[PDB]
């Protein structure tokens, strides 16, 4: 037992871990995704700068974990951190249709963690969850929402225009 | 073919794919060795900084292989990051010759690629990895072998004051 | 023999004198591209901008080449400058295609340079080559290929209102 | 027809071509005689800054050109650009004597260009040559005519220490 | 073994301490050439100081060597340092050709180092030399052809006064 | 006989040249001690830092030696400089020792040079070693006498704890 554990169940310290897990399989995604924009047969720049600030948030979630995990007094396991579905993502629209799904994916876990944390009575790990997560999910799918609305009425993925546009107006 | 492409060799292409599963492997493993450290009973902090920041130096080599691929109009096919061969790196200085051998099988990977891309007639990828990679790795491996040479020198691991001090003196 | 001259192959210099008539013939024809679009029935401002600022840059590469023949003791041997093989270029789109052959066929020649210079154990005039020509090249022709693949996906050259808008979008 | 075209006659239109032609031309032979300046086996820097900045200028006179014949609604036509009549220039005297020479011709070129102009009844080509040109190549002239003076009252060529110093004091 | 040590060729180690004990003589030789041109009876300060330079330059570029020695797990073996050939140089051109001979020398010497490191596939030893070396050397040499060139034409050895002019304009 | 010579000994003058001799040989000794703990297998860099500013120091006390000579009218006679006695130094304490033996007999060498001057009536060079070198000579004999006794006190050369910490804290 570490000196500093009080009130941090094992359950609570397996789910942390595989949150961890979770959050850098995200990163990967959104790196696949952002190099997807980069090559010359796709070229849309705005789009490859948003998904890479996004693999690099997921980094820095996943990181915010495994403190969390050393501060409670549990012990860090890594697993292998899996390829992403794709390698061709195919249009801007269809990549933010995946991270729309990938973001809710997340959220769904963060919330199963918040409820384990819920019925052991881990106040500390609750509001870990709710000052640093929920919020920011939220806040993430709302905006892949709002960015799948205006693809999708401007006529992605059909229309390479809207694409080009949306990625100078929306995204740059 | 993509438009772009000229002078690359399939050969080259697959062999950056596989030296950009190899950073990113390469990144996970100091992340791994950075949290650590950041346990309550090891508590280096320094030690934790360090692998940090060469965990996201590895990152960042691995974007720039992926932003050569995109460039050359080879194509990204990212493969599974296995995870770090160890839980627990035992001490500063283990975690330090790990890391030397982590940095010198690396940097054997990066000769192979070089040859290869001489035996191709590729000379903006030897270029490349010249420019970008092989200095790079011999002055890691070189701060790495000075950090093992001191460490023992001092007299870890056996000494916890030792390690305490490089941690302060020299990592600090 | 000038007192200089060190290592510097004939065949190295007379290929030297060919690669200088070859970047001045491109900055000749990104001239001719750039005040195409510079006509009042073509009125696209910053594709002339973009081709004469290319153009201006070939016209420094050629010059940076005198430079080395004379550092290197070798003597310049001018020729004809050949007309650009177009006088209308018929459209932004089309423009961009002709720019992305016209530097896959200075990269290769700058390959084949390379190639000669390894043959005669130059290794100052590859170094030469790599470090101002080939990186310089492949992202010329990846910038070129962004161009073309985002003027084709919003439908240039039949849409005016796609090269009006790439010409303000991307060029501006 | 273009839509802009005004009192500008296809005669006027192919004058212009024809001094585009010599424009590029002067520029062509400035090159070459800065980079005979830049021999190991001249040496004479300050000869070499003085012909290249004249070779950037003659540059910029053939675009002024070019762009004119744009707002005219005349037709740029580009022909190959004649090699320099001399690899070796012999001199700073002889070089300084050929380009007084060389703009002596372009003079000419200008004057019947603008007598043209002048029976074409075409005022607004008239004042374009006047003011853009005219005392350009008056001053080019004299102040070549005044460095000829110079140099030969030093004692040019035989005197490589008067062509030394005259590069050193009056072109340095 | 060095722990560093990784695709180090033996044979590599012994020429960079003969490149070592090369660029000390070289450093030598121009401290007596400095301080011939600061004697009494000479009294050419600029040439005093121009040698000056080219000796703490030497001495840089053999400490670079010994760093790069260590860097790659070689170990430096120094040698006596041999007295220059002279101890009066008798003039400034007289200096200035020599100088020129010993940099072709000390290049000569590194292109068989590049051509060693070729044939050991050390690249991060070809690309050492390429980035520090070659292209020293070759300006270094360029510089000094210019300066036995200006020195000729205005008349040394005999013309005292082209070294005393020659001195305050081009060295001063 | 120079023009400027009064006073001055040609025995004085073949001391200085042995002086000259005696302080390049110090300057590649301290250059060698430097880059020994350059080594991995070394590893103190503050030591190194030292020894190497030691080297540049000697070096400037040969090039005022040598100014001296021409000031008065001697003339400077190079010789051979010496390799060191050393490859290997062993410690940072075996260092200090061999530092303070090499600048004892420097300085006996110095108050030699001084005693000739004496028995020469040549107050102008005793003056000039007074002034430039005796004192110099005393600090850093003083100043290395307290770097063996702190090292000593320490527990160096057994304690490489010792030798970091003095790395640190003194040379630091
Ligand atoms: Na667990
Ligand atoms: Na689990
Ligand atoms: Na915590
Ligand atoms: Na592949
Ligand atoms: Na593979
Ligand atoms: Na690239
Ligand atoms: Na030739
Ligand atoms: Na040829
Ligand atoms: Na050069
Ligand atoms: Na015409
Ligand atoms: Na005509
Ligand atoms: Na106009
Ligand atoms: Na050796
Ligand atoms: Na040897
Ligand atoms: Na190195
Ligand atoms: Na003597
Ligand atoms: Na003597
Ligand atoms: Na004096
Ligand atoms: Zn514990
Ligand atoms: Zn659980
Ligand atoms: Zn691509
Ligand atoms: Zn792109
Ligand atoms: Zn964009
Ligand atoms: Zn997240
Ligand atoms: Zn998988
Ligand atoms: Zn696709
Ligand atoms: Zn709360
Ligand atoms: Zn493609
Ligand atoms: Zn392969
Ligand atoms: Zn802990
Ligand atoms: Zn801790
Ligand atoms: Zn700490
Ligand atoms: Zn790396
Ligand atoms: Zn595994
Ligand atoms: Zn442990
Ligand atoms: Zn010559
Ligand atoms: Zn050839
Ligand atoms: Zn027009
Ligand atoms: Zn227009
Ligand atoms: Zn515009
Ligand atoms: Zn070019
Ligand atoms: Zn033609
Ligand atoms: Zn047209
Ligand atoms: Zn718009
Ligand atoms: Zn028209
Ligand atoms: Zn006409
Ligand atoms: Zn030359
Ligand atoms: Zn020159
Ligand atoms: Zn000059
Ligand atoms: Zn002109
Ligand atoms: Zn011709
Ligand atoms: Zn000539
Ligand atoms: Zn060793
Ligand atoms: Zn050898
Ligand atoms: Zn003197
Ligand atoms: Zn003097
Ligand atoms: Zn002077
Ligand atoms: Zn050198
Ligand atoms: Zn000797
Ligand atoms: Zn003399
Ligand atoms: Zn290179
Ligand atoms: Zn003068
Ligand atoms: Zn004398
Ligand atoms: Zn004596
Ligand atoms: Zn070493
Ligand atoms: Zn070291
Ligand atoms: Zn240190
Ligand atoms: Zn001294
Ligand atoms: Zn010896
Ligand atoms: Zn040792
Ligand atoms: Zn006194």
Not at 16 to 33: G, K
Not at 98 to 116: D, I, M, R, T, Y
Request: net charge negative; charged share 30%; proline share 2%.
């Amino acid at each position: 037992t570490s000196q500093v554990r009080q009130n941090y169940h094992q359950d609570s310290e397996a789910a942390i871990n595989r949150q961890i897990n979770l959050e850098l399989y995200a990163s990967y995604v959104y790196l696949s995704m952002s190099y997807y924009f980069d090559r010359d047969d796709v070229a849309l720049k705005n789009f490859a700068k948003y998904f890479l600030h996004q693999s690099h948030e997921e980094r820095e979630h996943a990181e915010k974990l495994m403190k969390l995990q050393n501060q409670r007094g549990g012990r860090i396991f890594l697993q292998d951190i899996k390829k992403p579905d794709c390698d061709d993502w195919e249009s801007g629209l269809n990549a933010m249709e995946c991270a729309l799904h990938l973001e809710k994916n997340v959220n769904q876990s963060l919330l199963e963690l918040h409820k384990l944390a819920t019925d052991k009575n881990d106040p500390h790990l609750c509001d870990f969850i709710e000052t640093h997560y929920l919020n920011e999910q939220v806040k993430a799918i709302k905006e892949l929402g709002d960015h799948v609305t205006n693809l999708r009425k401007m006529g992605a993925p059909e229309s390479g225009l809207a694409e080009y546009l949306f990625d100078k107006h929306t995204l740059g």
